[PDB]
Design a protein around this ligand. Structure first.
Ligand SMILES: *[C@@H]1O[C@H](CO)[C@@H](O[C@@H]2O[C@H](CO)[C@@H](O[C@@H]3O[C@H](CO[C@H]4O[C@H](CO)[C@@H](O)[C@H](O)[C@@H]4O)[C@@H](O)[C@H](O[C@H]4O[C@H](CO)[C@@H](O)[C@H](O)[C@@H]4O)[C@@H]3O)[C@H](O)[C@H]2NC(C)=O)[C@H](O)[C@H]1NC(C)=O
Ligand SMILES: *[C@@H]1O[C@H](CO)[C@@H](O[C@@H]2O[C@H](CO)[C@@H](O[C@@H]3O[C@H](CO)[C@@H](O)[C@H](O[C@H]4O[C@H](CO)[C@@H](O)[C@H](O)[C@@H]4O)[C@@H]3O)[C@H](O)[C@H]2NC(C)=O)[C@H](O)[C@H]1NC(C)=O
Ligand SMILES: *[C@@H]1O[C@H](CO)[C@@H](O[C@@H]2O[C@H](CO)[C@@H](O[C@@H]3O[C@H](CO)[C@@H](O)[C@H](O)[C@@H]3O)[C@H](O)[C@H]2NC(C)=O)[C@H](O)[C@H]1NC(C)=O
Ligand SMILES: *[C@@H]1O[C@H](CO)[C@@H](O[C@@H]2O[C@H](CO)[C@@H](O[C@@H]3O[C@H](CO)[C@@H](O)[C@H](O)[C@@H]3O)[C@H](O)[C@H]2NC(C)=O)[C@H](O)[C@H]1NC(C)=O
Ligand SMILES: *[C@@H]1O[C@H](CO)[C@@H](O[C@@H]2O[C@H](CO)[C@@H](O)[C@H](O)[C@H]2NC(C)=O)[C@H](O)[C@H]1NC(C)=O
Ligand SMILES: *[C@@H]1O[C@H](CO)[C@@H](O[C@@H]2O[C@H](CO)[C@@H](O)[C@H](O)[C@H]2NC(C)=O)[C@H](O)[C@H]1NC(C)=O
Ligand SMILES: *[C@@H]1O[C@H](CO)[C@@H](O[C@@H]2O[C@H](CO)[C@@H](O)[C@H](O)[C@H]2NC(C)=O)[C@H](O)[C@H]1NC(C)=O
Ligand SMILES: *[C@@H]1O[C@H](CO)[C@@H](O[C@@H]2O[C@H](CO)[C@@H](O)[C@H](O)[C@H]2NC(C)=O)[C@H](O)[C@H]1NC(C)=O
Ligand SMILES: *[C@@H]1O[C@H](CO)[C@@H](O[C@@H]2O[C@H](CO)[C@@H](O)[C@H](O)[C@H]2NC(C)=O)[C@H](O)[C@H]1NC(C)=O
Ligand SMILES: *[C@@H]1O[C@H](CO)[C@@H](O[C@@H]2O[C@H](CO)[C@@H](O)[C@H](O)[C@H]2NC(C)=O)[C@H](O)[C@H]1NC(C)=O
Ligand SMILES: *[C@@H]1O[C@H](CO)[C@@H](O[C@@H]2O[C@H](CO)[C@@H](O)[C@H](O)[C@H]2NC(C)=O)[C@H](O)[C@H]1NC(C)=O
Ligand SMILES: *[C@@H]1O[C@H](CO)[C@@H](O[C@@H]2O[C@H](CO)[C@@H](O)[C@H](O)[C@H]2NC(C)=O)[C@H](O)[C@H]1NC(C)=O
Ligand SMILES: *[C@@H]1O[C@H](CO)[C@@H](O[C@@H]2O[C@H](CO)[C@@H](O)[C@H](O)[C@H]2NC(C)=O)[C@H](O)[C@H]1NC(C)=O
Ligand SMILES: *[C@@H]1O[C@H](CO)[C@@H](O)[C@H](O)[C@H]1NC(C)=O
Ligand SMILES: *[C@@H]1O[C@H](CO)[C@@H](O)[C@H](O)[C@H]1NC(C)=O
Lengths: 129, 453, 111, 102, 132, 132, 53, 53
């Protein structure tokens, strides 16, 4: 199986920084990309960025640079190499940033492209005072 | 006449596409120095020379660099060979130990930090009852603070015991000629203007490929194969951003890199037949390692590649460059091995530009790690042996590996950034010309003859 | 292509002195048995271009004892010991590795 | 950049009445995918890249199209088959359609 | 130089022309098909895969009438339902790469017919020698 | 279903019957005789033992008169000291397993005679073409 | 045949050296009980009755 | 007067297992299929130059 567990929803004051940890398990974490996407109410989806955990190579959307940061943490043991953690840190909060955020993975088939996602985290609600 | 019979012709020139293993073959100059000098002195055969590179007409095979094989098995072969040059060498189980570090004797400021730590620590002798005290030097990127006194430990000693490389073996690149066994063939696109995808109009078979040296470098691939006449960019699907962009330009940019420090190695016996080559004393001025490139040739080659980038992106587009966005060390900067020691050398100074739709040099400072973790393996490290003397090397910068920021919301600027990522994208810049086909003889054809009794 | 890069192109050479015309190839011109097949071309204006040497160092029967070839791998230099008015005009490199072969850019001997 | 536009947009059909959405790209040469988001639940890719449906997907969703013109035909639908549909080009997202139970 | 005529005699150099190049080149592809511490295991299994591949083809000729002739002939009439083409156009226009696809829809129909024809002819030959 | 007649054409299906079944099935047993980290070494030496065993048999047909006919015929008369049987009783009453044991008391007398007869025939044929 | 251990374990990693992990048994939560197996009475009395025959 | 072993500054040493022996045994070499081994059967022959039998 492929499992993606996020953290819980959170109240945050305006102008703070928010950390969201997407934890993946059930596959070799060093192989696939982790993308972050947001759903704002009454806007449609909006892409945010992606990370490759093999070296932590990141890339961001244009209209959110200087505000987002991505880190990762691998499993370093010969027993349980599967699980991986990807942290998102999101700063410069506005009340427009109240939305729900999703971590996703590339679809596992070989003919599947880079963007069409298969597995989805349960979604995290971020709400700004 | 119309009573056509059939005949099966054997040996018919026709093929399909397949995937096989190949066989390396290196030249006899690596066999001049013998007995485990470098790798592929026992793994590859000495070359049957001068391959039968002949031409072919009226022919068109579609190619692909992206779903091509023989790049996958090379990324398996180089790692599998890279392990085999380590098992005869020392393991560093007795060295993960409490360290007593202090600053090197130097005029140190309060803000700016030295990169050398003079560390003393207990150690075993050849004998077991007695023990010795000895000291060495270490960089800031190999010690962390375990927690008055200030005692450290090595960084990798909570995950993996480390393997010293034997100083007898070397890591210099060498040519490898891949060959296909009997029953296969290797095609080669001899066309000039060919973006690595779609049909090539003039193929030619070959016995074995030409010189393919292996390098290790993330940004700014080195000593590569030169482009033929123009400057070319290649990609899989350019409006997609998640795939890299391979830039292969024409004239090489000379790059000088050096460490001006003069070192000393110091042998420390750990046990019976166990020799740990630590860093001894530093004679001269404690100075920072760096690299130079030429100013005007780099400003020229960016003006070439912008002229080549504007074909796929509209004529009227502002094009700028930026430092890398972040991550681990050896994907933000660029890495290379220079005479048996690894650099990590900042490239903010090359990519600070913008481009409108109309005697000096560039120094860039480096860092030197001693232990590496190449290919990000769970149980692996490699303490590099410190080498003597002031060190420098000269190389050719041949191509780039780039990445577009694929931002939404009405972009007229198309900002670009370097990025390493996979090591395989280095390799695909070398094997884009080839593909491997399988001969299937024994065709069949209607003609006019009847076999008698 | 495997096009030849000639250096130097225009050589005003006085009579009696030496001359050196080098080419540099993209790959080695090592033919698949070991024997490279280079050719150096004479040319006067108004004449069909004809052969000096057909190897690295094996010439045409009828070429005098003054024109010689040398070099290895990619760098291949022609050397004329004594230059006469017969030697003036456009010279060329040539390949024997594989079709399509490439003529050079032309190296003119002048006075 | 690349603009996406679903059509007809808000639709209204009773259960059992098969339908077809259609979302138009600004310019062609590319191949879209689709998504199916229920009422307050996790979104779900049901067909990838033109016509290849994902795992756990019945074949009553059939997508097709070419040029700048992509169709998604839904047949033999349920009252539970309907939810909100999206269509995606590389990172760009259309505003979506909805097929109200009449 | 080496000239143009050498690549007509080169390995796979005849593949770009029509059948007329294939009427003279057939010794070369038949020749180069055969002649070829952890690494030695992989090259050893590559070599034995090569010869195990070759000997299947010599076997598959052996069960037909063509023993080692390299240009055989046989006795099944050509059904025009497959080809539907004139004579010289598949002897002056098409290449063997081009000839591959038009007969790639159907295979071992032809090979089963050849096995059946040879298995019949050997029985009729044994019956001919039986009264002899 | 698949029926009864399919196993007549299966691998070793004709072994239970008399020769009349085995008079037609001979391509199948000839076909399946060829096509097949320390485990790789053991299966590799198994594969090369298999093809070495095959090629010994092709050699031993090569030194006789029949190269690849797969239904030979040759020129030594059958000595009735061994058989002592009527004709059709070894064509309709016996199986090849049953035929094995009745010629297992003696072997390579026949293989000795065939080499000598083929060598003598090649000698007389060389004389016949030598006067030619 | 059903077979079980009803005790509840916890594993506990002990690092011996670099890259070493001795998975010892941690604490036992609940009732210290004995592992056991069950089979059916009548099926066994039947299947012995077959094999005696 | 304290000592050490002689080889401890160069190499750790391997004890041979006392089960195995080092007694000589006859070895017959053999050439594989496709070769041959000649043997000079001459009496007066200094090992160099041509042997006639
Ligand atoms: C891109 O390509 C260039 C071109 O090859 C590479 O540059 C070469 O780099 C290698 C090593 O990185 C150099 O090899 C070293 O040369 C040292 C200098 O010796 C030379 O000069 C002396 C004096 O003239 C000569 O006598 C000698 O023969 C050499 O020509 C040597 O000291 C080195 O030897 C050391 O290692 C050996 C290992 O066996 C020890 O035994 C020795 O004692 C000694 O410690 C070594 O041979 C080579 O010279 C460079 N070429 C040039 C032209 O400068 C770049 O490195 C490459 N870039 C990348 C990233 O790979
Ligand atoms: C980014 O660009 C690359 C190339 O620029 C592009 O790669 C190509 O994508 C197509 C899919 O559209 C791959 O698939 C092939 O498509 C051809 C027709 O172009 C057909 O022969 C095959 O598909 C047909 O058959 C299917 C059977 O159900 C049909 O459903 C389908 O609609 C087609 O009719 C074949 O699969 C093609 O292989 C690649 N090219 C290469 C060289 O790999 C890529 O798709 C682009 N990325 C995105 C996200 O669009
Ligand atoms: C790293 O730190 C060690 C500390 O153990 C330094 O070693 C010691 O360095 C001091 C001076 O640097 C040496 O003292 C000198 O000794 C000579 C000879 O006895 C004497 O003539 C001088 O007057 C002075 O006392 C000391 O010997 C030396 N000890 C050892 C074991 O080496 C080391 O120098 C430091 N290295 C660096 C690069 O900072
Ligand atoms: C791309 O350019 C920017 C702009 O300079 C670089 O950001 C800079 O990064 C450095 C170090 O990451 C920051 O330095 C500071 O150093 C103190 C020292 O203690 C530390 O405490 C601070 O937290 C911070 O690290 C510097 O402030 C920062 N500049 C700005 C304007 O934020 C960036 O590093 C460049 N990219 C690469 C790959 O080098
Ligand atoms: C030796 O190095 C340590 C650590 O680098 C120095 O301790 C502090 O270093 C930071 C920055 O390197 C300075 O900002 C502090 O002021 C230092 N603290 C003190 C108390 O000096 C230390 O100064 C160095 N030198 C010595 C002689 O220990
Ligand atoms: C190396 O070993 C010596 C011998 O034990 C260590 O010296 C002892 O250090 C402890 C703690 O610092 C003291 O309590 C003892 O009194 C020391 N012994 C003596 C005889 O003085 C020493 O610390 C070790 N490390 C280094 C870097 O020398
Ligand atoms: C590389 O070049 C090939 C051909 O020169 C391009 O393939 C064709 O490109 C046109 C226009 O982009 C398309 O209309 C065709 O459909 C393409 N052919 C096929 C078979 O797909 C290819 O796009 C070029 N690639 C890049 C990255 O420039
Ligand atoms: C680096 O340091 C070493 C230290 O040994 C220098 O080697 C010495 O060089 C001088 C002058 O050539 C000789 O007189 C000494 O005999 C050398 N020492 C030894 C032990 O051989 C070396 O020259 C220095 N290199 C640089 C570039 O400064
Ligand atoms: C990199 O270093 C090499 C060292 O050989 C430089 O090559 C020489 O540089 C000097 C400059 O003082 C010139 O006078 C020589 O003519 C150069 N040699 C040759 C063969 O050209 C090279 O210039 C350096 N490159 C850069 C960009 O600094
Ligand atoms: C790579 O080089 C750049 C430019 O030299 C460095 O950026 C500077 O960082 C210092 C902090 O040490 C700042 O005070 C400067 O203002 C920065 N320069 C600019 C132009 O912003 C950068 O830090 C280097 N990379 C690393 C990893 O240190
Ligand atoms: C970098 O590329 C240059 C391209 O000119 C190489 O320079 C030539 O290399 C050939 C091959 O040995 C020599 O015969 C020429 O004499 C070189 N020309 C010049 C002007 O140097 C160069 O070798 C490449 N490598 C390095 C390390 O600079
Ligand atoms: C064995 O012990 C573990 C101790 O963790 C039990 O796991 C806990 O189960 C309760 C019951 O739902 C949960 O509320 C806890 O969150 C669990 N702990 C952890 C760390 O996940 C486990 O249930 C016990 N086994 C049985 C059969 O009761
Ligand atoms: C072994 O354990 C299994 C556990 O599923 C038993 O299967 C069920 O046991 C319950 C007893 O409470 C019955 O009510 C169910 O009908 C059983 N399931 C089925 C599918 O029959 C099984 O009976 C146990 N066997 C023994 C011999 O105890
Ligand atoms: C090793 O130590 C470093 C530094 O304290 C720490 O960041 C890392 O998590 C440790 N590794 C493991 C596997 O705990
Ligand atoms: C080992 O010790 C002996 C005895 O002192 C000495 O002769 C020999 O040189 C030593 N070995 C080495 C490699 O120094």
């Amino acid at each position: 199986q492929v499992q993606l567990v996020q953290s819980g929803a959170v109240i945050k004051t305006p102008g703070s920084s928010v950390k969201i940890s997407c934890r993946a398990s059930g596959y070799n974490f060093r192989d696939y990309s982790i993308h972050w996407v947001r759903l704002i109410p009454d806007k449609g989806f909006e892409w945010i960025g992606w990370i490759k955990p093999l070296w932590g190579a990141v890339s961001y959307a244009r209209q959110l640079q200087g505000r987002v940061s991505m880190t990762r943490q691998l499993s370093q043991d010969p027993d349980d190499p599967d699980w991986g953690v990807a942290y998102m840190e999101f700063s410069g909060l506005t009340p427009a940033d109240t939305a729900e955020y999703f971590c996703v993975r590339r679809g596992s088939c070989d003919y599947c492209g880079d963007f069409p996602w298969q597995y989805w985290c349960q979604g995290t609600v971020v709400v700004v005072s | 006449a119309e009573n056509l019979w059939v005949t099966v012709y054997y040996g018919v020139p026709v093929w399909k596409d397949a995937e096989t293993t190949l066989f390396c073959a290196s030249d006899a100059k690596a066999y001049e120095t013998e007995k485990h000098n470098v790798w592929a002195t026992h793994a590859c055969v000495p070359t049957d020379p001068n391959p039968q590179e002949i031409h072919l007409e009226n022919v068109t095979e579609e190619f692909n660099m992206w779903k091509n094989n023989m790049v996958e098995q090379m990324h398996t072969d180089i790692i599998s060979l890279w392990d085999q040059s380590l098992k005869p060498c020392v393991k560093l189980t007795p060295l993960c130990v409490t360290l007593q570090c202090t600053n090197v004797t130097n005029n140190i400021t309060d803000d700016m930090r030295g990169e050398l730590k003079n560390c003393s620590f207990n150690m075993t002798t050849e004998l077991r009852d007695k023990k010795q005290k000895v000291y060495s030097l270490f960089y800031r990127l190999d010690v962390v603070q375990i927690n008055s006194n200030k005692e450290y430990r090595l960084i990798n000693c909570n995950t993996s015991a480390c393997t010293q490389a034997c100083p007898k073996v070397s890591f210099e690149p060498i040519p490898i000629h891949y060959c296909a066994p009997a029953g296969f063939a290797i095609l080669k696109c001899k066309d000039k203007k060919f973006n690595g995808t779609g049909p090539c109009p003039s193929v030619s078979t070959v016995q074995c490929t030409h010189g393919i040296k292996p390098v290790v470098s993330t940004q700014l691939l080195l000593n590569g194969s030169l482009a033929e006449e123009e400057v070319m960019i290649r990609s899989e699907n350019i409006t997609n951003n998640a795939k890299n962009i391979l830039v292969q330009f024409n004239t090489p940019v000379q790059i000088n890199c050096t460490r001006p420090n003069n070192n000393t190695r110091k042998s420390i016996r750990i046990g019976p037949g166990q020799a740990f080559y630590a860093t001894g004393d530093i004679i001269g001025d404690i100075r920072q390692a760096h690299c130079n490139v030429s100013k005007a040739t780099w400003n020229e080659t960016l003006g070439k590649v912008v002229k080549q980038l504007r074909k796929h992106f509209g004529n009227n587009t502002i094009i700028r460059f930026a430092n890398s966005s972040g991550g681990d060390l050896e994907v933000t900067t660029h890495s290379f091995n220079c005479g048996g020691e690894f650099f990590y050398c900042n490239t903010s100074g090359l990519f600070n530009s913008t481009w409108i739709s109309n005697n000096d040099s560039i120094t860039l400072p480096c860092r030197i790690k001693q232990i590496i973790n190449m290919w990000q393996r769970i149980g692996q490290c490699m303490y590099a042996p410190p080498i003597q003397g002031v060190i420098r090397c000269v190389s050719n910068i041949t191509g780039l590996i780039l990445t577009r920021d694929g931002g939404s919301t009405n972009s007229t600027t198309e900002t670009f950034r370097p990025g390493g990522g996979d090591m395989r994208d280095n390799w695909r810049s070398e094997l884009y010309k080839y593909k491997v086909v399988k001969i299937e003889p024994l065709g069949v054809a209607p003609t006019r003859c009847k076999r008698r009794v | 292509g495997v096009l030849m890069t000639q250096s130097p192109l225009s050589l005003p050479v006085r009579l009696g002195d030496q001359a050196s015309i080098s080419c540099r190839s993209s790959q080695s011109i090592v033919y698949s048995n070991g024997n490279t097949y280079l050719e150096w071309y004479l040319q006067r204006p108004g004449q069909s271009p004809k052969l000096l040497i057909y190897k690295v160092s094996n010439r045409f029967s009828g070429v005098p004892d003054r024109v010689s070839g040398s070099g290895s791998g990619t760098d291949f230099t022609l050397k004329i010991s004594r230059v006469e008015a017969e030697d003036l005009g456009v010279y060329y490199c040539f390949q024997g590795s594989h079709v399509p072969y490439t003529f050079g850019g032309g190296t003119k001997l002048e006075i | 950049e690349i603009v996406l536009t679903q059509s007809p947009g808000i639709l209204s059909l009773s259960p059992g009445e098969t339908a077809t959405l259609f979302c138009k790209a600004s310019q062609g040469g590319n191949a879209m995918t689709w998504y199916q988001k229920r009422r307050g639940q996790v979104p779900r890719l049901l067909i990838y890249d033109t016509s290849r449906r994902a795992s756990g997907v019945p074949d009553r969703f059939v997508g097709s199209g070419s040029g700048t013109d992509f169709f998604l035909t839904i047949n033999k639908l349920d009252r539970e088959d309907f939810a909100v549909y999206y269509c995606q080009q590389f990172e760009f997202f259309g505003l979506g359609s909805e097929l109200e139970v009449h | 130089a080496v000239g143009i005529g050498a690549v007509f005699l080169g390995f796979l150099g005849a593949a770009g022309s029509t059948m007329g190049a294939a009427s003279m080149t057939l010794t070369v592809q038949a020749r180069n098909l055969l002649s070829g511490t952890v690494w030695g295991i992989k090259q050893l299994q590559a070599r034995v895969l090569a010869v195990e591949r070759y000997l299947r083809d010599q076997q598959l000729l052996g069960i037909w009438g063509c023993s080692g002739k390299l240009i055989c002939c046989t006795n099944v009439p050509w059904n025009s339902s497959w080809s539907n083409r004139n004579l010289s156009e598949i002897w002056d226009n098409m290449t063997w790469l081009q000839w591959d696809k038009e007969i790639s829809n159907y295979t071992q129909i032809i090979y089963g017919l050849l096995e059946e024809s040879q298995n019949q002819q050997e029985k009729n030959e044994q019956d001919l020698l039986a009264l002899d």
